[PDB]
Design a protein around this ligand. Sequence first.
Ligand SMILES: [Mg+2]
Ligand SMILES: [Mg+2]
Ligand SMILES: [Mg+2]
Ligand SMILES: [Mg+2]
Ligand SMILES: [Mg+2]
Ligand SMILES: [Mg+2]
Ligand SMILES: [Mg+2]
Ligand SMILES: [Mg+2]
Ligand SMILES: [Mg+2]
Ligand SMILES: [Mg+2]
Ligand SMILES: [Mg+2]
Ligand SMILES: [Mg+2]
Ligand SMILES: [Mg+2]
Ligand SMILES: [Mg+2]
Ligand SMILES: [Mg+2]
Ligand SMILES: [Mg+2]
Ligand SMILES: [Mg+2]
Ligand SMILES: [Mg+2]
Ligand SMILES: [Mg+2]
Ligand SMILES: [Mg+2]
Ligand SMILES: [Mg+2]
Ligand SMILES: [Mg+2]
Ligand SMILES: [Mg+2]
Ligand SMILES: [Mg+2]
Ligand SMILES: [Mg+2]
Ligand SMILES: [Mg+2]
Ligand SMILES: [Mg+2]
Ligand SMILES: [Mg+2]
Ligand SMILES: [Mg+2]
Ligand SMILES: [Mg+2]
Ligand SMILES: [Mg+2]
Ligand SMILES: [Mg+2]
Ligand SMILES: [Mg+2]
Ligand SMILES: [Mg+2]
Ligand SMILES: [Mg+2]
Ligand SMILES: [Mg+2]
Ligand SMILES: [Mg+2]
Ligand SMILES: [Mg+2]
Ligand SMILES: [Mg+2]
Ligand SMILES: [Mg+2]
Ligand SMILES: [Mg+2]
Ligand SMILES: [Mg+2]
Ligand SMILES: [Mg+2]
Ligand SMILES: [Mg+2]
Ligand SMILES: [Mg+2]
Ligand SMILES: [Mg+2]
Ligand SMILES: [Mg+2]
Ligand SMILES: [Mg+2]
Ligand SMILES: [Mg+2]
Ligand SMILES: [Mg+2]
Ligand SMILES: [Mg+2]
Ligand SMILES: [Mg+2]
Ligand SMILES: [Mg+2]
Ligand SMILES: [Mg+2]
Ligand SMILES: [Mg+2]
Ligand SMILES: [Mg+2]
Ligand SMILES: [Mg+2]
Ligand SMILES: [Mg+2]
Ligand SMILES: [Mg+2]
Ligand SMILES: [Mg+2]
Ligand SMILES: [Mg+2]
Ligand SMILES: [Mg+2]
Ligand SMILES: [Mg+2]
Ligand SMILES: [Mg+2]
Ligand SMILES: [Mg+2]
Ligand SMILES: [Mg+2]
Ligand SMILES: [Mg+2]
Ligand SMILES: [Mg+2]
Ligand SMILES: [Mg+2]
Ligand SMILES: [Mg+2]
Ligand SMILES: [Mg+2]
Ligand SMILES: [Mg+2]
Ligand SMILES: [Mg+2]
Ligand SMILES: [Mg+2]
Ligand SMILES: [Mg+2]
Ligand SMILES: [Mg+2]
Ligand SMILES: [Mg+2]
Ligand SMILES: [Mg+2]
Ligand SMILES: [Mg+2]
Ligand SMILES: [Mg+2]
Ligand SMILES: [Mg+2]
Ligand SMILES: [Mg+2]
Ligand SMILES: [Mg+2]
Ligand SMILES: [Mg+2]
Ligand SMILES: [Mg+2]
Ligand SMILES: [Mg+2]
Ligand SMILES: [Mg+2]
Ligand SMILES: [Mg+2]
Ligand SMILES: [Mg+2]
Ligand SMILES: [Mg+2]
Ligand SMILES: [Mg+2]
Ligand SMILES: [Mg+2]
Ligand SMILES: [Mg+2]
Ligand SMILES: [Mg+2]
Ligand SMILES: [Mg+2]
Ligand SMILES: [Mg+2]
Ligand SMILES: [Mg+2]
Ligand SMILES: [Mg+2]
Ligand SMILES: [Mg+2]
Ligand SMILES: [Mg+2]
Ligand SMILES: [Mg+2]
Ligand SMILES: [Mg+2]
Ligand SMILES: [Mg+2]
Ligand SMILES: [Mg+2]
Ligand SMILES: [Mg+2]
Ligand SMILES: [Mg+2]
Ligand SMILES: [Mg+2]
Ligand SMILES: [Mg+2]
Ligand SMILES: [Mg+2]
Ligand SMILES: [Mg+2]
Ligand SMILES: [Mg+2]
Ligand SMILES: [Mg+2]
Ligand SMILES: [Mg+2]
Ligand SMILES: [Mg+2]
Ligand SMILES: [Mg+2]
Ligand SMILES: [Mg+2]
Ligand SMILES: [Mg+2]
Ligand SMILES: [Mg+2]
Ligand SMILES: [Mg+2]
Ligand SMILES: [Mg+2]
Ligand SMILES: [Mg+2]
Ligand SMILES: [Mg+2]
Ligand SMILES: [Mg+2]
Ligand SMILES: [Mg+2]
Lengths: 118, 205, 59, 137, 122
Amino acid sequence: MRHLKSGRKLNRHSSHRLALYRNQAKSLLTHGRITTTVPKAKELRGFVDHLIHLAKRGDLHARRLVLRDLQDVKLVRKLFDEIAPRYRDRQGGYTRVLKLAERRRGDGAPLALVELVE
Amino acid sequence: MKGILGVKVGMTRIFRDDRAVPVTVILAGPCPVVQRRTPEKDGYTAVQLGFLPQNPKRVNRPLKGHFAKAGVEPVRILREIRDFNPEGDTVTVEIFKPGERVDVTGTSKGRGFAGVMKRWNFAGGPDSHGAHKIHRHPGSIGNRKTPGRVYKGKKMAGHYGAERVTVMNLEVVDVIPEENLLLVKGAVPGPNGGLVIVRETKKAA
Amino acid sequence: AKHPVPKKKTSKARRDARRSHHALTPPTLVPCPECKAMKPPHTVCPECGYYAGRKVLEV
Amino acid sequence: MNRGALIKLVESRYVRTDLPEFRPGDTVRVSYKVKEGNRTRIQDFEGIVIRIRRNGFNTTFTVRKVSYGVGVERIFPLHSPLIQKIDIVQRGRARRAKLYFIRNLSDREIRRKLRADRKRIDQDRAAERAAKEEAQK
Amino acid sequence: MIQPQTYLEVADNTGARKIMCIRVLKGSNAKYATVGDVIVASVKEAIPRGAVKEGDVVKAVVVRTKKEIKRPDGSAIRFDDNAAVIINNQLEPRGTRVFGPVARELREKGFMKIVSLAPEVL
RNA sequence: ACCGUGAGGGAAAGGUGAAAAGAACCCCGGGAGGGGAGUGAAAUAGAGCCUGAAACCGUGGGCUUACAAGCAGUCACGGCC
RNA sequence: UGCGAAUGCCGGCAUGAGUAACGAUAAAGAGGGUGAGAAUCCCUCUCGCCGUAAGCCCAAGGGUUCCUACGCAAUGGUCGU
RNA sequence: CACCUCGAUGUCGGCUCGUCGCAUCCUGGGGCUGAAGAAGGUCCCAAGGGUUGGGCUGUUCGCCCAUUAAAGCGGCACGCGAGCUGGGUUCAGAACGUCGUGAGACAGUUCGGUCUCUAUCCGCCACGGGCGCAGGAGGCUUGAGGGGGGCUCUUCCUAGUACGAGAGGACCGGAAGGGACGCACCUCUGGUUUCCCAGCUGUCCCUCCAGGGGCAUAAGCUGGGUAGCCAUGUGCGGAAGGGAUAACCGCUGAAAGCAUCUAAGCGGGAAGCCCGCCCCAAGAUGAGGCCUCCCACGGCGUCAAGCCGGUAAGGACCCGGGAAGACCACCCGGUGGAUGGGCCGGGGGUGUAAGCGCCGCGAGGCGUUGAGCCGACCGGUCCCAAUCGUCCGAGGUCUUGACC
Ligand SMILES: [Mg+2]
Ligand SMILES: [Mg+2]
Ligand SMILES: [Mg+2]
Ligand SMILES: [Mg+2]
Ligand SMILES: [Mg+2]
Ligand SMILES: [Mg+2]
Ligand SMILES: [Mg+2]
Ligand SMILES: [Mg+2]
Ligand SMILES: [Mg+2]
Ligand SMILES: [Mg+2]
Ligand SMILES: [Mg+2]
Ligand SMILES: [Mg+2]
Ligand SMILES: [Mg+2]
Ligand SMILES: [Mg+2]
Ligand SMILES: [Mg+2]
Ligand SMILES: [Mg+2]
Ligand SMILES: [Mg+2]
Ligand SMILES: [Mg+2]
Ligand SMILES: [Mg+2]
Ligand SMILES: [Mg+2]
Ligand SMILES: [Mg+2]
Ligand SMILES: [Mg+2]
Ligand SMILES: [Mg+2]
Ligand SMILES: [Mg+2]
Ligand SMILES: [Mg+2]
Ligand SMILES: [Mg+2]
Ligand SMILES: [Mg+2]
Ligand SMILES: [Mg+2]
Ligand SMILES: [Mg+2]
Ligand SMILES: [Mg+2]
Ligand SMILES: [Mg+2]
Ligand SMILES: [Mg+2]
Ligand SMILES: [Mg+2]
Ligand SMILES: [Mg+2]
Ligand SMILES: [Mg+2]
Ligand SMILES: [Mg+2]
Ligand SMILES: [Mg+2]
Ligand SMILES: [Mg+2]
Ligand SMILES: [Mg+2]
Ligand SMILES: [Mg+2]
Ligand SMILES: [Mg+2]
Ligand SMILES: [Mg+2]
Ligand SMILES: [Mg+2]
Ligand SMILES: [Mg+2]
Ligand SMILES: [Mg+2]
Ligand SMILES: [Mg+2]
Ligand SMILES: [Mg+2]
Ligand SMILES: [Mg+2]
Ligand SMILES: [Mg+2]
Ligand SMILES: [Mg+2]
Ligand SMILES: [Mg+2]
Ligand SMILES: [Mg+2]
Ligand SMILES: [Mg+2]
Ligand SMILES: [Mg+2]
Ligand SMILES: [Mg+2]
Ligand SMILES: [Mg+2]
Ligand SMILES: [Mg+2]
Ligand SMILES: [Mg+2]
Ligand SMILES: [Mg+2]
Ligand SMILES: [Mg+2]
Ligand SMILES: [Mg+2]
Ligand SMILES: [Mg+2]
Ligand SMILES: [Mg+2]
Ligand SMILES: [Mg+2]
Ligand SMILES: [Mg+2]
Ligand SMILES: [Mg+2]
Ligand SMILES: [Mg+2]
Ligand SMILES: [Mg+2]
Ligand SMILES: [Mg+2]
Ligand SMILES: [Mg+2]
Ligand SMILES: [Mg+2]
Ligand SMILES: [Mg+2]
Ligand SMILES: [Mg+2]
Ligand SMILES: [Mg+2]
Ligand SMILES: [Mg+2]
Ligand SMILES: [Mg+2]
Ligand SMILES: [Mg+2]
Ligand SMILES: [Mg+2]
Ligand SMILES: [Mg+2]
Ligand SMILES: [Mg+2]
Ligand SMILES: [Mg+2]
Ligand SMILES: [Mg+2]
Ligand SMILES: [Mg+2]
Ligand SMILES: [Mg+2]
Ligand SMILES: [Mg+2]
Ligand SMILES: [Mg+2]
Ligand SMILES: [Mg+2]
Ligand SMILES: [Mg+2]
Ligand SMILES: [Mg+2]
Ligand SMILES: [Mg+2]
Ligand SMILES: [Mg+2]
Ligand SMILES: [Mg+2]
Ligand SMILES: [Mg+2]
Ligand SMILES: [Mg+2]
Ligand SMILES: [Mg+2]
Ligand SMILES: [Mg+2]
Ligand SMILES: [Mg+2]
Ligand SMILES: [Mg+2]
Ligand SMILES: [Mg+2]
Ligand SMILES: [Mg+2]
Ligand SMILES: [Mg+2]
Ligand SMILES: [Mg+2]
Ligand SMILES: [Mg+2]
Ligand SMILES: [Mg+2]
Ligand SMILES: [Mg+2]
Ligand SMILES: [Mg+2]
Ligand SMILES: [Mg+2]
Ligand SMILES: [Mg+2]
Ligand SMILES: [Mg+2]
Ligand SMILES: [Mg+2]
Ligand SMILES: [Mg+2]
Ligand SMILES: [Mg+2]
Ligand SMILES: [Mg+2]
Ligand SMILES: [Mg+2]
Ligand SMILES: [Mg+2]
Ligand SMILES: [Mg+2]
Ligand SMILES: [Mg+2]
Ligand SMILES: [Mg+2]
Ligand SMILES: [Mg+2]
Ligand SMILES: [Mg+2]
Ligand SMILES: [Mg+2]
Ligand SMILES: [Mg+2]
Ligand SMILES: [Mg+2]
Ligand SMILES: [Mg+2]
C-alpha cells in the first residue's frame, strides 16, 4: 500500500540514499549541468534548490547548515558568491530537468539533464 | 427518497449535551438537476444530479444545455437518485434536518493486492515453533479427490478496497446551509476529497 | 528438477497463443522543431533540441 | 473547492480561548464538570501535565498525580466545554516535549528534575502585577 | 483490559494481596474485563489469617486498569495498576474498607457501597 | 582428448571441383556477413562446401476460426479457393 | 534381411520460457578521456567496505598465469575498447 | 472380502481453511404432559446463524477448572503434509523389563533421530488484452442472474400483577444496555512513523577552537514524533416490513343424517423459504435502455458484402501526477494550466539553533529565544517541468409492416 507518502527510495538504504543526494549535489554545484537517470534527477531538484535558497540567506548559520550536506569549504564559497546571487530575485525553480531521447545501452536506463536554471 | 452528491471533507469531534460527537464533514454542494427520466421513456424514476461546477469547457460536444440549467456542465453529473423528485430545481443540503439518519455511499480506500489476512482476517500461521515460510498464508484450500476442486467463492488474496461501500443509518449531527456543509457522525467510506452520495435511510424509507 | 513440473509438452498452438501479446510497439516519434529529423516527444531532440533550456547543442 | 481544512476549521465554533498558558512540565489544577450519579459537581484534578497533543481544535493534554498511593493520569481536550476553568499552580522546566519518563520515577527525584521555571514564574506575577494596575486607573 | 491470566492488586482489606483473573464474567465469550466488570480469579497471594486464603477461587470487580478508560465527554482516565475488590455472589464487597481511587464507572455500573467506601472517585 | 590418486577407463571426428580456376576490384560494415563483378558444366559445388531425408524454426499465399466442449477422426451434405 | 515402444543405444531438435537465475545486502555518484560502439576500460573528484585484513612476507601446490605491443570470435554468468 | 493402486494412492494428532448432512446442542415455531406458575420431561417442524477460555496427556477421546443461550453428532482419501507442523507411529544409536545358549526379538517402555526454492493443464482469487454487441462517438442507466448478510444474552416497565398455602413467579406487550462476529473509518484513545527534531558514547575526519560530517544495521544508541497504514480506538449492520409455507391451530364441510381442519374450498402459523437491505452484474451472443454529439465523402466494388484514402464527433500516443495500482486498468492534470517540484503562509513535530554578551577557575549556567531546524498534512504562488506535435477514427446490408 503505502499511500500519500513522499520521497522515492532509490533501491538504497537510508544512509546510502542520503549520501547519494549529497554527492549529486556537489557534482551539480560544480559543473552546473549533470546527466543522470530521470528519477534520480526528479528527486535532485528539491535537494539542491533548498541548498541554494539557503545560500540566498547568506547568514553564517545557513552556511554551516549547507556544510552538513556539501562538506567542502570552497564550492560553498562558490555557491555563496557566484551561484546564490544569480537568483536573488528568483524565488524557487533554481533548477531544470530536461529528459534525453537516448537510453543508456545495455541497461536501457532513460536519462535526463539537470542544470542550474537561468 | 431524497439524495444528494458531495465530497468527504474531513473528520472532527463536536461536543453536544456535554458529550463528544465524532462526525464526518461532507460538503453536499448545490446539485443542479440536469435530467429526470420517468416511467415515460425510461421505466423508472430518478434525477441526474451534476455536482462540482468547474470545467473551463473541457466539456466537448456531449454537453447538455438541453436541460436549461447546465450552468457550465459539472465534473461529475454521474449518478441519479432513483425514486426522487426534488423541489423542482437545484437540490441542496436543505433536504436534511438534524436528527435524520442517512445512508452514505462511498468508494472505499484502495489497498491493491491484499493478502488473505486483511482481505479476509485469516489467522495465518504461527510465527515460531514449526513455522516455515507460511506465516501469513491461507493454509489448506480444499479436500482430497472429492470434490477435487476449489469452491466458487474461495476467500483468497486479491485486489481489495477501492470499491463501492455504503455505511448505513448515520445520524445527521448538524447541517450548515450557508456553506453547503453536512455533518454526519462517524464512518463515511473513501478518502477525503473523494466523491460520496448521501441518501435517505432504509430503516424507514 | 524438483516438485511441480509440466504434465504435458505444450503444443505449438498453445505456446504461440501465449505469445499473442508479445508483439512490439514502434516508438512514438514527432517531427523536430528546428532540425528535420524525427525524435521522441518531450525529449531534448538530439540535434540542438530546444531554445530556453540548453539544447545539448550539436552546434 | 480547495477550502479543505479551513472548512473543517469552520465547524470549530467550540474553540475556546478563556484558558491559561501552560506547558508540559508545569503543574496545573483543572476543574471539570462531572455527572456523579444524577446530580453534578465541579470536581477538581491537580497534577503535573505529562503531555500536550497539538492538533488545532481537539488538541489534548494529559495530567498525572498520585491519588491515595496510586498514580492517576487524566486526559482532557484542551477545548472541552466541561472544563469550567484551569489555574496554573506552578511552572516547571520541561527540557523535553513529552514527559512520560516521570512514571517510573515518581518520588522526590521527579523534583530536582522538574525545577520551577523562574523565567516563566517571574512572568505571570509581573504579568498580573501590570494587568492589575493598567486595569483600574 | 483485564484477561484470564492477568494479575490484579487487591484494593480492599479482605485479606488478599494478589488475585489472578481466571474468567471474565460477561457474555458467552468476552475477551477483556474493564472497570465495573466482574471477574473470577484465584487468590495468588494473601495475608495470614485474613478472610480469604491462597488458592481460593473468588469473584471480584475491576476498580482500576492500566489501559485507559474512555468517557463519552471525550476525556480518559488511567491508573498505574489493575486492581479489584473481592465480592460475594450478591456482588456485595466481602471485606470492609477499600483502598485507593476507583473509576466513577463503578457507580454507573451499580456498585454503590464500593464507590462510597472509596477514599477518592476519579 | 577427457575421466580417475592409481591400477584403469576411454570418445568424438571422412567427402568443394575434372581442375583452386578457393572469388582481383567496387558497395554497405569496426569486423562478421552480404550485394555486384569474376571462375566453373554447375556456386541453394563458396570452403560451417557431394547428395541433403525427418523432427524442429521461419516468411508468403489459399481455406478456416472469437456462444462453443474435445482420442481430434470419420460419414454426409453444403460454402469459399 | 523389414522396428514404434525394451525408464532401450547414439545423435539432432523440441516443451517448460523469454520463465528461475546471473553466486554473499561492503554502495554507489558525476566529470573528463578513448572508441564503430561505454553503467562495465582509463583518469579526476565525492561516497562506502576491510584493517590479527579483505594489508604484507614465507612453504606447499600451480607452471607463463609475469612485463609490453597489437587484438575481442570464443572464455568473462550482462557489456566490454 | 482381496476388486484399481506395490516402474509408490505419504500413515495418527495438532494448525490453517473450510464446506456439506441433520439422526438438532442452542436460538425460532409447535403437540402431549403424571404441564398451577416458573422450571422440566417427551415427541414433531426447523440446517439461518451460533456452537467459549483453560489444566492433564503426542493423543483422538476422555476427566477436570471457570464460564455459557448452547459447549451437537457426523461426512468430505478417519477433508486438508506439491498448505505448515512432526509430539505419536515408523529405519540406522542406546537403555530397561521380558524372551532366546546365541545373533537377536517385543500393538512393551525409554532418550535421540535429513518433511524436497520454480505450478504445464484443470480448479480458485484477482487484473487486463482482443473481437463481438451490423453507422460511429461521449455520458447516464435498467437488473436477468449471482454473491454478501442471517447469532444471541442480561436488566427494567408491564407486575411482584395472572398462577400458588407459601416459596416462587409467566404469557403478551414495551425500554435500555451487552458478548462475539461483519463492513467502513482516523475525530478521539493507542501503535508504528529508515532520518521529522533533540540528546549521548567511541573513533576518524573538515579546520586549531567553536561548529559539524562518516561509521558503529541493512536506523550506532537513546528520548520523542506529523501524514499515511492501523486496533486496543470510532461509526454502522443482523432488521423492520410484504408474501408464500412447516409442524401445528382453526373456519366451512360431505362421503358416512351424526361427526371430522379436508376429500372441494378458506383463515392463521417458524431464527427457516421468496422478496426486502448491501455488493456484483447486458459476453443477459436474449450483448437492453435513455440523453447528447458527428454525419450520410473521394475513387474504385459495373451487380452480392466490399477496397483505399483522407476526415467529422471523439479517441489514443506522449508528458505531470494520484489514499488508483505488481504490469496493465482506473482517476485527475497537460500553459485557454495550480499536475508534480521549488518558494511562501498555516498546521505538526521537536523543545529555547548558531553567533554574541554576562556569571563561573571549571564542568557548565543565564539572556537573546518557544529560538532554530523542520517528510508526507491545508492552501497560495507560473520560479522549474507538463514545449512542439503524431497517429486512429463514421458516411450506415438486406427483408418486412406502419407513417409524410
Ligand atoms: Mg534491483
Ligand atoms: Mg548506516
Ligand atoms: Mg492503494
Ligand atoms: Mg477485512
Ligand atoms: Mg482482528
Ligand atoms: Mg480469525
Ligand atoms: Mg490460534
Ligand atoms: Mg499471528
Ligand atoms: Mg522445520
Ligand atoms: Mg520464518
Ligand atoms: Mg494434498
Ligand atoms: Mg505456429
Ligand atoms: Mg497452599
Ligand atoms: Mg583430472
Ligand atoms: Mg590425470
Ligand atoms: Mg559432410
Ligand atoms: Mg576431390
Ligand atoms: Mg572424382
Ligand atoms: Mg566503408
Ligand atoms: Mg561476395
Ligand atoms: Mg555471380
Ligand atoms: Mg559463365
Ligand atoms: Mg544450378
Ligand atoms: Mg552469391
Ligand atoms: Mg541443389
Ligand atoms: Mg548449405
Ligand atoms: Mg552441388
Ligand atoms: Mg551443415
Ligand atoms: Mg562428385
Ligand atoms: Mg550441401
Ligand atoms: Mg503463415
Ligand atoms: Mg447462450
Ligand atoms: Mg460464431
Ligand atoms: Mg477449451
Ligand atoms: Mg472433431
Ligand atoms: Mg466438401
Ligand atoms: Mg510392437
Ligand atoms: Mg526409442
Ligand atoms: Mg553437430
Ligand atoms: Mg511460469
Ligand atoms: Mg515470475
Ligand atoms: Mg528474477
Ligand atoms: Mg548480487
Ligand atoms: Mg564521456
Ligand atoms: Mg572520436
Ligand atoms: Mg560512473
Ligand atoms: Mg563514466
Ligand atoms: Mg558493478
Ligand atoms: Mg613453486
Ligand atoms: Mg597462456
Ligand atoms: Mg597482466
Ligand atoms: Mg591494450
Ligand atoms: Mg570477446
Ligand atoms: Mg564480445
Ligand atoms: Mg560476454
Ligand atoms: Mg560465471
Ligand atoms: Mg576499439
Ligand atoms: Mg488384489
Ligand atoms: Mg479371487
Ligand atoms: Mg506412475
Ligand atoms: Mg506420484
Ligand atoms: Mg428421536
Ligand atoms: Mg427449539
Ligand atoms: Mg410452564
Ligand atoms: Mg415442550
Ligand atoms: Mg427433523
Ligand atoms: Mg502436554
Ligand atoms: Mg469434543
Ligand atoms: Mg484417554
Ligand atoms: Mg472445552
Ligand atoms: Mg466438520
Ligand atoms: Mg476409516
Ligand atoms: Mg486423514
Ligand atoms: Mg511435509
Ligand atoms: Mg496431518
Ligand atoms: Mg519423532
Ligand atoms: Mg525433530
Ligand atoms: Mg538369558
Ligand atoms: Mg514393531
Ligand atoms: Mg519422546
Ligand atoms: Mg540433541
Ligand atoms: Mg521416540
Ligand atoms: Mg515442496
Ligand atoms: Mg487438466
Ligand atoms: Mg475484457
Ligand atoms: Mg443485435
Ligand atoms: Mg436479482
Ligand atoms: Mg447466500
Ligand atoms: Mg438472494
Ligand atoms: Mg451465507
Ligand atoms: Mg419475591
Ligand atoms: Mg393468591
Ligand atoms: Mg418481552
Ligand atoms: Mg443487540
Ligand atoms: Mg490525525
Ligand atoms: Mg492517532
Ligand atoms: Mg503518525
Ligand atoms: Mg563523531
Ligand atoms: Mg586537512
Ligand atoms: Mg571540536
Ligand atoms: Mg570512513
Ligand atoms: Mg569502517
Ligand atoms: Mg555498515
Ligand atoms: Mg545518525
Ligand atoms: Mg511512542
Ligand atoms: Mg476490538
Ligand atoms: Mg418475516
Ligand atoms: Mg408472514
Ligand atoms: Mg400468511
Ligand atoms: Mg365442523
Ligand atoms: Mg394452510
Ligand atoms: Mg397463511
Ligand atoms: Mg432475526
Ligand atoms: Mg451497479
Ligand atoms: Mg447497449
Ligand atoms: Mg437517463
Ligand atoms: Mg504511475
Ligand atoms: Mg486527459
Ligand atoms: Mg498539449
Ligand atoms: Mg502545483
Ligand atoms: Mg512551516
Ligand atoms: Mg539557552
Ligand atoms: Mg544560543
Ligand atoms: Mg571568564
